[PDB]
Amino acid sequence: RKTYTLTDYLKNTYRLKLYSLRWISDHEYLYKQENNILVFNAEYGNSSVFLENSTFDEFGHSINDYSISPDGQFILLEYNYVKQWRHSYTASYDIYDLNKRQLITEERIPNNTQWVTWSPVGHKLAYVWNNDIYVKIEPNLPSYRITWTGKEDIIYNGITDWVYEEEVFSAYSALWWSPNGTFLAYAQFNDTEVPLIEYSFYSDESLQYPKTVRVPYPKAGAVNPTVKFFVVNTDSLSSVTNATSIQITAPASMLIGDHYLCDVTWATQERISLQWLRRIQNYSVMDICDYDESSGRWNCLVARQHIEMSTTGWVGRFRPSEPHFTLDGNSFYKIISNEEGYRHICYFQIDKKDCTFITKGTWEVIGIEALTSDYLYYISNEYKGMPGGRNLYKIQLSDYTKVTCLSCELNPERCQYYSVSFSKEAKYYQLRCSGPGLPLYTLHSSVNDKGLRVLEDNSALDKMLQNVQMPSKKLDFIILNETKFWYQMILPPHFDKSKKYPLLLDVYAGPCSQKADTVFRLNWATYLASTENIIVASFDGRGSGYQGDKIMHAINRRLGTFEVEDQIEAARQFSKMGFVDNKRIAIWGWSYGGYVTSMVLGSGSGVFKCGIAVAPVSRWEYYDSVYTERYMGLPTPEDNLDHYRNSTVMSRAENFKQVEYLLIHGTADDNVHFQQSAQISKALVDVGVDFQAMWYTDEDHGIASSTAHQHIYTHMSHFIKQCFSLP
Amino acid sequence: RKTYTLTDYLKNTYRLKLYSLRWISDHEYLYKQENNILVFNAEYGNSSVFLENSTFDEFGHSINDYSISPDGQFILLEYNYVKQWRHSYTASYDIYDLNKRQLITEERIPNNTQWVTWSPVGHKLAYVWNNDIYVKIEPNLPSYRITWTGKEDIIYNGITDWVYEEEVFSAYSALWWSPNGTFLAYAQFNDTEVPLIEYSFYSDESLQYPKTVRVPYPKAGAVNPTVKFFVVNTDSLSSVTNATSIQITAPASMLIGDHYLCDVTWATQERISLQWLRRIQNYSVMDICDYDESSGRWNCLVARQHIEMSTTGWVGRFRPSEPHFTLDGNSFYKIISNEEGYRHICYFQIDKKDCTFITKGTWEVIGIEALTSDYLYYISNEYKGMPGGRNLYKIQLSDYTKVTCLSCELNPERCQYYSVSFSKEAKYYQLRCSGPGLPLYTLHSSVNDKGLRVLEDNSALDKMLQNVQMPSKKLDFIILNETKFWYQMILPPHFDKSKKYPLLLDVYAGPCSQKADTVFRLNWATYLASTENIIVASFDGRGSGYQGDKIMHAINRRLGTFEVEDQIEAARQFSKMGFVDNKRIAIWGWSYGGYVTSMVLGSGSGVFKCGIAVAPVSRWEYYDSVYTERYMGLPTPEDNLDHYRNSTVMSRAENFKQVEYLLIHGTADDNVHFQQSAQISKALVDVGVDFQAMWYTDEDHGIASSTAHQHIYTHMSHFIKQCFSLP
Ligand SMILES: *[C@@H]1O[C@H](CO)[C@@H](O[C@@H]2O[C@H](CO)[C@@H](O)[C@H](O)[C@H]2NC(C)=O)[C@H](O)[C@H]1NC(C)=O
Ligand SMILES: *[C@@H]1O[C@H](CO)[C@@H](O[C@@H]2O[C@H](CO)[C@@H](O)[C@H](O)[C@H]2NC(C)=O)[C@H](O)[C@H]1NC(C)=O
Ligand SMILES: Cc1nc2nc(C(=O)N3CCOCC3)cn2c(-c2ccc(Cl)cc2Cl)c1CN
Ligand SMILES: Cc1nc2nc(C(=O)N3CCOCC3)cn2c(-c2ccc(Cl)cc2Cl)c1CN
Ligand SMILES: *[C@@H]1O[C@H](CO)[C@@H](O)[C@H](O)[C@H]1NC(C)=O
Ligand SMILES: *[C@@H]1O[C@H](CO)[C@@H](O)[C@H](O)[C@H]1NC(C)=O
Ligand SMILES: *[C@@H]1O[C@H](CO)[C@@H](O)[C@H](O)[C@H]1NC(C)=O
Ligand SMILES: *[C@@H]1O[C@H](CO)[C@@H](O)[C@H](O)[C@H]1NC(C)=O
Ligand SMILES: *[C@@H]1O[C@H](CO)[C@@H](O)[C@H](O)[C@H]1NC(C)=O
Ligand SMILES: *[C@@H]1O[C@H](CO)[C@@H](O)[C@H](O)[C@H]1NC(C)=O
Ligand SMILES: *[C@@H]1O[C@H](CO)[C@@H](O)[C@H](O)[C@H]1NC(C)=O
Ligand SMILES: *[C@@H]1O[C@H](CO)[C@@H](O)[C@H](O)[C@H]1NC(C)=O
Ligand SMILES: *[C@H]1O[C@H](CO)[C@@H](O)[C@H](O)[C@H]1NC(C)=O
């Protein structure tokens, strides 16, 4: 009988099915079946073909994605896709009028467009091209140029520079339509004095001289980009006169120094919320800005700013939390750490002091998902006190005490990890369960929270997997200093506590991470347990998220300490349990996991026989400012420079003589620079330690090209199989 | 009897002693002994300390080198040495007045000087600083400025650019003083439009942003630097009037296209010899340029031009050979490829056409070493018919049939490979024997070729080696289509022709190379044979040198052809021999040896279990123009594009599934760019071939930092051991 093989992982032999739909009103959504775009009625479940796979067979280009105007009249077609960073890319665009069932060829959207977006209502367009912003009121009409300052690598209007995209907004876009669709707000980033990271890109075999890539990127403590914020009135645009952008300056308490613009939320048609963060990320201000028709200006009264501080750590999980505004725009809710350091929903009324906690407990809210007049819907990990689970709840607005669990009980053995998607105005919602069993997609009505229908049960995949000897998963915890810390273990088929198993510790362990959860996954570890009979453990130690600040801020200004310690201690704990071959314990990790794997390998602990680090950080001065400084402060003598340097992998080289080490990195890694590994290897050479290495030419942090993806996991499997003495 | 261990190799436990001297006159030389500089009388062997080690115990800096003027009045002190390429570097210099016994302290040689030389006689100096040439008539006097055009990375006056240094002059200098010291000849190079190679340098851990290094480097087919030649009269220099340098123009037959200046020789006080070469290294012209005392000009009579062509390949082994002039400068001798294709000594008389061969035979003259009115001395491989041996011969210039071997019989057992060093006017000479026994340096008088005395017999080392199981070398040959091809074999001690030994083929096989010779070496192979009982073999197949053009030019316009195939056939032959285990045959090479190893691993032969390539070329369009075009012509559709394209390693990628491959490259290789290994690995990943890699951070082609050196050989040693299942 057969197992989950490496070739299965690499080749996607057992495919997970999903069901991504796109809401388009409070009761209809779109969906693709055989590349036909169907539109669905949510209430009754009937559907029909919105767009036929047939159309565009003679288009000329392969179509990459699409977006429909709110008013259903038009559709955007995205082709010539060219990926840049984690979120950004350039592409070409066409517009198809639906009622005319024709393709528009007037005033077309330029090739190399960097970003396009419909207005929330109607058929307006805004797009960035050559770092400048443009606006078409209508798709067959000439665009109005809004900005003139766009300049490659220096001035960005309406799109983000590298660090904002990666660490602040999590997106390339820096444009925000007012709900009216009347205003276009946007940010401008200035990278004039931001230093450049430089690396070689070799390209095709045919490229005689390797090309040098230069990217404005601030490493820890280096000069940051600066930011301006503007708002333009789209209703008032002249063919003759320029477009007048009104600026909104940051609070004076931000203007005194380096800061970031970290969130932008429209409250009403004439109220905006701005979140600002001090470069020292323990202080931030929310600014409420109202339009004044008499002047045309936007004013943010100092009086109604809201303010957040931390004395134990930084602000928010990764940034200040997002405000969810009540419909009238006079109050809002948002996740906040309470007096005991747990993140709960807090209620804020604009011109009033403080805020009011509507939730509390020894658990945390993960996200606020929806807000109607009678209810606030949110995900939390309360159920059964399992930080690694997720369920939908709703709280009765007029009686905070009445909290209903919407998902806890749908299928309590198959489903303990939910996410959700609401329709406009929240009349219907889609539930998505991700484990511990097979992913399961259902539809629901808000009225009586009635289960309308099952959308996808992955029955087909399930029939296949009954054939294979699949691994099982154990989610438990252990006690350390009177504190529970959770772990998981993917266990091989027919597990036997009277046998001894080799064990791989799969590490990430970065701040607010969680590696022990109830998600079902078909991945490299599935192969390792199913086929090679290795146990694959992970452990959430100090610094991990979703358990309260006491645990999360343990690591404050002290990266490469308690999280490293704890992974080691976790392994001592596992050896204690009697079914692990304490001669065959490995450790591996990627990104931040690579850094921790290295530090572990470098600790002299004597627990680990061998390990793999992929694209690991090696010293924090090498990584970016927003991320690094968030946790480490600045690397100056008067701040945290000491620990910046007590915490490098390099300084641990000698101890690598006791272990077998595999070090991997892509040459075109724009995120964690090849530098970081290049310095690790040199430190190891310089001290006479033998080790094994692999570079991947022209790959970035993902090393995700199909061929490279296959090569590295193959390479790594050999490594581990040697180390463990397996066939 | 212990064994020769890797450590012995890396720690240099068993050291070869040398005897490096510089002839100072017709009868004395200098010799550094315990940081004491000594003068030695050749005839009697008596000495006197010229400069005590005690001096400069108070200097302030570590002193890297020294240079005493021809008149012994001053000495240059080189310190603050920084290495650039293979020959180039910059440094600081102090001058010490040997008479006044003190350091001159004004009008100093600037810091970061790029080159200095004394004139041939006296105490003039010429130097290069910021790519401009300056001249001091006396060490305390201010220097006159010869050129003003010097510009970093663009215009070089009196020093060479990257290719010229590496591939033409085998030196940084481009300064040639007339024998008087009267004139200063120099070249100027213009790399205006020469593309730049760019790569990352990671420096010490403290550097936060890596540096991009940028070097004008013409790759096969790209724009080449241009050159001009000038001569300045050193006596008529003015304090206010800018010195005037007279330009010599290359011959019309050279100006029609791209060309090189390949050699400069002063013939008399008033006659310069210049050799030029076409970018297509088919054709070269030697110009003879006389000074016109009235004119002030220099004239190059077309009738005097001596032309070398080749229809079978290129001119010269690596470049047209150096001419050796008679005292009166009216005639010269030059190594030339004869009608049978063997390189022999040719006698040229200035105003007469063609020339006369002074020697002949099926062997070759390697070098002309000295010239008097009575004798011409040269090194050749005639003795015992071995191309891999070297001997000093003299030929009576009044009767060419009268050749006598000066070294053949001194010590037939111990010595078969000599180099030599003559005093001026060749009154005496130092013989240096390199094997096959321990190195042995002797002094001799020309009068009757008497042996004067022994300088170094390496008896120290001999003593030490009496306690180690040393391996032996067999130097034999095989037949291939009726032609003899040589190889050598390092044989483990106590070699039993009955057993079967694993075999490592050590390859270079570049054009005009030679890996089978009679020289003594303590190297990696010594360790492998002695300690790990491996037979290390090397073979000189087609393309190799010192055996006639039929063999050397076989590879014309088809690198990665016969030399790759011949390495393969050699291996087969070696199997036939009943003492090699044909299941355990590996291969490895560096540089060209790296490319060949790759072509071989990727050929499909099934002969080799595994191989190592170190800094390999993989594609000839990536290597430089002077070396590459010499053998491949230009990479254009009209010339040799097809074979450029056919002889990439990348095209053989699939075949690598059959072998184990380790690929190694320094990230800072200015010579064979990392690009080349980056493209090999990408081809291997693209087609799903697994392999081993290792990059060396900030190392260059030589990978020679003491720590990198030790680390690469250790890494390589594990791999080889593993391949052969060696305990
Ligand atoms: C982006 O920021 C740069 C850097 O500060 C600005 O450049 C400066 O502009 C002022 C006014 O022109 C000058 O006085 C400075 O000398 C400039 N410094 C540099 C480094 O150039 C630039 O104006 C900003 N660009 C925009 C459009 O906001
Ligand atoms: C080095 O070579 C470059 C290219 O041949 C020369 O550049 C030219 O400069 C002259 C003016 O002296 C003009 O003919 C052109 O404007 C330039 N062309 C280019 C491509 O830049 C340059 O003159 C040379 N420098 C020296 C010292 O000879
Ligand atoms: C936005 C972001 N997303 C991420 N996903 C992973 C991830 O799980 N891995 C692990 C699995 O494979 C992909 C990366 C890591 N990151 C990081 C990140 C965090 C720390 C460091 Cl040191 C580097 C990065 Cl990129 C960042 C922040 N830039
Ligand atoms: C001036 C020169 N000297 C060299 N010595 C070696 C050598 O023997 N090995 C011995 C083994 O160690 C490496 C160098 C190789 N080269 C080459 C050379 C030739 C071809 C290529 Cl592809 C690269 C180089 Cl550097 C060049 C000219 N570039
Ligand atoms: C669903 O059916 C209703 C009633 O026939 C119809 O009006 C509506 O257009 C249908 N919607 C879809 C998505 O087909
Ligand atoms: C996009 O570029 C291609 C040619 O590269 C062309 O077919 C098309 O017309 C361009 N689109 C626009 C908006 O100009
Ligand atoms: C939207 O709100 C703005 C702000 O007052 C107002 O000026 C505008 O008329 C509104 N737009 C539309 C199209 O209703
Ligand atoms: C437990 O406390 C000890 C100090 O007494 C400390 O060494 C260790 O890090 C702690 N462990 C955890 C995981 O809290
Ligand atoms: C100086 O010379 C003496 C021999 O005369 C030698 O013994 C001593 O080591 C030398 N000092 C050095 C090498 O600095
Ligand atoms: C060697 O000895 C002779 C005879 O005294 C002397 O003239 C000569 O200068 C000496 N040479 C050296 C280098 O000491
Ligand atoms: C060297 O030769 C040049 C040219 O013949 C002449 O001008 C000069 O006087 C000579 N130098 C000496 C010092 O003999
Ligand atoms: C000799 O002939 C063989 C036959 O296989 C051929 O492959 C090879 O190229 C030839 N070698 C020489 C030395 O010409
Ligand atoms: C060279 O600079 C060094 C210090 O870097 C200094 O001692 C000296 O004055 C300089 N020498 C000259 C003459 O340029």
Short mmCIF file of N, CA and C in Angstrom, two decimals, chain B residues 456-508:
data_model
loop_
_atom_site.label_atom_id
_atom_site.label_comp_id
_atom_site.label_asym_id
_atom_site.label_seq_id
_atom_site.Cartn_x
_atom_site.Cartn_y
_atom_site.Cartn_z
N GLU B 456 71.31 25.73 -2.75
CA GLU B 456 70.34 25.08 -1.88
C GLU B 456 70.07 23.66 -2.38
N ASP B 457 70.20 22.67 -1.50
CA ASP B 457 70.02 21.26 -1.89
C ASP B 457 68.78 20.63 -1.26
N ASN B 458 68.08 21.41 -0.46
CA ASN B 458 66.86 20.96 0.17
C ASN B 458 67.07 19.72 1.02
N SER B 459 68.27 19.61 1.57
CA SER B 459 68.64 18.47 2.39
C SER B 459 67.82 18.47 3.68
N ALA B 460 67.35 19.65 4.07
CA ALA B 460 66.48 19.75 5.23
C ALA B 460 65.23 18.92 5.00
N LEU B 461 64.59 19.17 3.86
CA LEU B 461 63.34 18.53 3.50
C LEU B 461 63.57 17.03 3.31
N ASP B 462 64.63 16.70 2.59
CA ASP B 462 64.99 15.31 2.37
C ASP B 462 64.99 14.56 3.70
N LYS B 463 65.73 15.07 4.68
CA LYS B 463 65.74 14.47 6.01
C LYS B 463 64.32 14.21 6.50
N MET B 464 63.50 15.26 6.51
CA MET B 464 62.12 15.15 6.98
C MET B 464 61.32 14.05 6.27
N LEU B 465 61.50 13.95 4.95
CA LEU B 465 60.71 13.02 4.14
C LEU B 465 61.12 11.56 4.30
N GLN B 466 62.23 11.32 4.97
CA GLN B 466 62.69 9.95 5.21
C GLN B 466 61.74 9.26 6.17
N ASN B 467 60.81 10.03 6.72
CA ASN B 467 59.87 9.52 7.71
C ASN B 467 58.42 9.49 7.25
N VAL B 468 58.23 9.52 5.93
CA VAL B 468 56.89 9.55 5.36
C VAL B 468 56.76 8.63 4.16
N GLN B 469 55.65 7.91 4.09
CA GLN B 469 55.40 7.07 2.94
C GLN B 469 55.00 7.95 1.76
N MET B 470 55.99 8.45 1.02
CA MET B 470 55.71 9.27 -0.14
C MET B 470 55.21 8.48 -1.35
N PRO B 471 54.29 9.07 -2.11
CA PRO B 471 53.87 8.48 -3.39
C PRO B 471 54.93 8.71 -4.49
N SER B 472 54.80 8.02 -5.62
CA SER B 472 55.75 8.17 -6.73
C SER B 472 55.03 8.69 -7.96
N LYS B 473 55.80 9.21 -8.92
CA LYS B 473 55.23 9.66 -10.18
C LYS B 473 55.72 8.82 -11.34
N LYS B 474 54.78 8.32 -12.14
CA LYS B 474 55.10 7.67 -13.41
C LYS B 474 54.76 8.62 -14.54
N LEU B 475 55.72 8.84 -15.43
CA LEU B 475 55.54 9.72 -16.56
C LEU B 475 55.73 8.86 -17.80
N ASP B 476 54.64 8.45 -18.43
CA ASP B 476 54.76 7.62 -19.62
C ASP B 476 53.93 8.21 -20.75
N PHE B 477 53.60 7.40 -21.74
CA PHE B 477 52.71 7.89 -22.79
C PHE B 477 51.84 6.77 -23.35
N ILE B 478 50.81 7.15 -24.09
CA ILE B 478 49.99 6.21 -24.80
C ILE B 478 49.90 6.64 -26.25
N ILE B 479 49.43 5.73 -27.10
CA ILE B 479 49.27 6.01 -28.51
C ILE B 479 47.81 6.22 -28.85
N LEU B 480 47.54 7.21 -29.69
CA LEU B 480 46.20 7.49 -30.17
C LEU B 480 46.29 7.86 -31.64
N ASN B 481 45.82 6.97 -32.51
CA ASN B 481 45.98 7.18 -33.95
C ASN B 481 47.43 7.46 -34.25
N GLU B 482 48.29 6.56 -33.77
CA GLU B 482 49.71 6.57 -34.09
C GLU B 482 50.51 7.71 -33.46
N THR B 483 49.86 8.59 -32.70
CA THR B 483 50.55 9.69 -32.03
C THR B 483 50.75 9.38 -30.54
N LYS B 484 51.90 9.78 -29.99
CA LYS B 484 52.17 9.61 -28.56
C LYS B 484 51.59 10.77 -27.79
N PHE B 485 50.91 10.47 -26.69
CA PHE B 485 50.40 11.49 -25.80
C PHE B 485 50.82 11.15 -24.38
N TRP B 486 51.36 12.13 -23.67
CA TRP B 486 51.92 11.85 -22.36
C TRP B 486 50.92 11.97 -21.24
N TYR B 487 51.18 11.23 -20.17
CA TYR B 487 50.42 11.41 -18.95
C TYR B 487 51.36 11.21 -17.80
N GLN B 488 50.88 11.46 -16.60
CA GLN B 488 51.67 11.14 -15.42
C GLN B 488 50.73 10.54 -14.41
N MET B 489 51.28 9.85 -13.42
CA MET B 489 50.44 9.21 -12.42
C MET B 489 51.08 9.32 -11.07
N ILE B 490 50.38 9.92 -10.12
CA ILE B 490 50.84 9.85 -8.74
C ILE B 490 50.38 8.51 -8.18
N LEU B 491 51.33 7.66 -7.81
CA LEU B 491 51.00 6.33 -7.35
C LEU B 491 51.18 6.23 -5.85
N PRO B 492 50.16 5.73 -5.16
CA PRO B 492 50.23 5.50 -3.72
C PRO B 492 51.49 4.72 -3.39
N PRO B 493 52.03 4.91 -2.18
CA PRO B 493 53.24 4.16 -1.84
C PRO B 493 52.95 2.65 -1.81
N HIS B 494 53.98 1.82 -1.89
CA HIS B 494 53.78 0.37 -1.86
C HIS B 494 52.77 -0.01 -2.92
N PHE B 495 52.86 0.66 -4.05
CA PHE B 495 51.95 0.42 -5.16
C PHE B 495 52.02 -1.03 -5.64
N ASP B 496 50.88 -1.72 -5.61
CA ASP B 496 50.78 -3.11 -6.10
C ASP B 496 49.98 -3.16 -7.40
N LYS B 497 50.64 -3.48 -8.51
CA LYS B 497 49.97 -3.48 -9.81
C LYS B 497 48.92 -4.58 -9.90
N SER B 498 48.81 -5.37 -8.83
CA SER B 498 47.82 -6.44 -8.76
C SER B 498 46.45 -5.97 -8.29
N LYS B 499 46.43 -5.03 -7.34
CA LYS B 499 45.16 -4.55 -6.78
C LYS B 499 44.52 -3.52 -7.69
N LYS B 500 43.32 -3.10 -7.33
CA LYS B 500 42.64 -2.06 -8.09
C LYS B 500 42.45 -0.81 -7.25
N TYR B 501 42.89 0.32 -7.78
CA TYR B 501 42.83 1.57 -7.03
C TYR B 501 41.82 2.51 -7.63
N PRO B 502 41.16 3.31 -6.79
CA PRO B 502 40.28 4.33 -7.36
C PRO B 502 41.16 5.36 -8.05
N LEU B 503 40.61 6.08 -9.02
CA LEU B 503 41.42 6.97 -9.83
C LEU B 503 40.81 8.35 -10.02
N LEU B 504 41.58 9.38 -9.67
CA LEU B 504 41.19 10.77 -9.89
C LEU B 504 41.95 11.35 -11.07
N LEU B 505 41.21 11.78 -12.09
CA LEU B 505 41.80 12.45 -13.23
C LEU B 505 41.84 13.95 -12.97
N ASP B 506 43.05 14.47 -12.85
CA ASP B 506 43.28 15.88 -12.58
C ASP B 506 43.50 16.56 -13.92
N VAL B 507 42.57 17.42 -14.33
CA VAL B 507 42.63 18.02 -15.66
C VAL B 507 42.86 19.53 -15.71
N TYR B 508 43.57 19.96 -16.75
CA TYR B 508 43.57 21.37 -17.12
C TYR B 508 43.23 21.46 -18.61
#
